[PDB]
């Protein structure tokens, strides 16, 4: 949820409705709506980092995020709208 996203420092770079540095979270939910393993896929990107999906600015690995929190964040992102 938003509190967890704040606690794990996701909000420096992402808001729900609009693009900041990384993509708007609802835009992530929209893109992955039909991907079956979307939540585990996104949790993997949160833990390990991402580049090239949205631009050439990489998201660094979020080394302080626990497995359970990465999955809770991915799950929450997917519900957005």
List the binding residues for heme c. 10, 13-14, 59
Q: Which amino acids are annotated as binding site, given as ranges?
A: 10, 13-14, 59
Residues that bind ligand HEC (rule: CB under 6 A) add up to a total of: 27
Which residue in 9, 18, 66, 79 binds ligand HEC (CB under 6 A)? 9
Q: Which string of b and e fits 16-26 if b means at least 16 CB within 10 Å?
A: beeeeebbbbb
Interface positions, 20-59, toward ligand HEC (CB under 6 A):
21-23, 28, 42, 45-46, 50-55, 57-59
Contacts with ligand HEC, residue ranges (CB under 6 A)? 8-10, 12-14, 21-23, 28, 42, 45-46, 50-55, 57-60, 62, 65, 73, 77
């Amino acid at each position: 949820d938003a509190d967890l996203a704040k606690k794990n420092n996701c909000i420096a770079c992402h808001q729900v409705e609009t693009k900041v540095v990384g993509p708007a979270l609802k835009d992530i939910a929209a893109k992955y709506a039909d991907k079956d393993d979307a939540a585990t896929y996104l949790a993997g990107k949160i833990k390990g980092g991402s580049s090239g999906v949205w631009g050439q600015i990489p998201m660094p690995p979020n080394v302080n995020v626990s497995d359970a929190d990465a999955k809770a964040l991915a799950d929450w992102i997917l519900t957005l709208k």
